[PDB]
Design a protein around this ligand. Structure first.
Ligand SMILES: [N+]
Ligand SMILES: [N+]
Ligand SMILES: [N+]
Length: 119
């Protein structure tokens, strides 16, 4: 939402940038260090993500326009995607969050057009 975008743009060094914010409001998240930290911030703020427990799959399911229990195949597919990314070995917390969210890229794009993965 608007609120979390403005707050994270202030929280993250470099993110209060006109050009990046145009992308962010268009749901476009480039692979750059500032945007890495921005994506982490939004995930933390919306309770979609956690540095330790990873991606909250039920929370994201709901953020994809659903009010019910996540489909089993949605959970399975993303748990597997996230495990394959070996997130625990990614030392940079922003890079780790960005890499995590890449698993859910296709879902968010389709939509636009607790079930922690690491319990
Ligand atoms: N962040
Ligand atoms: N299911
Ligand atoms: N992982």
């Amino acid at each position: 939402n608007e609120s979390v975008i403005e707050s994270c743009s202030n929280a993250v060094q470099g993110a209060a940038n006109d050009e990046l914010k145009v992308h962010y409001r268009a749901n476009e998240f480039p692979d750059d260090p500032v945007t890495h930290c921005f994506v982490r911030c939004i995930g933390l703020e919306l309770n979609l993500y956690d540095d330790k427990y990873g991606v909250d799959l039920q929370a994201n399911w709901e953020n994809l326009g659903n009010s019910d229990d996540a489909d089993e195949e949605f959970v399975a597919k993303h748990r597997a995607c996230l495990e394959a990314k070996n997130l625990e070995t990614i030392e940079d917390l922003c890079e780790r969050a960005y890499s995590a969210f890449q698993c859910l890229r296709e879902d968010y794009e389709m939509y636009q057009n607790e079930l922690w993965s690491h319990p």
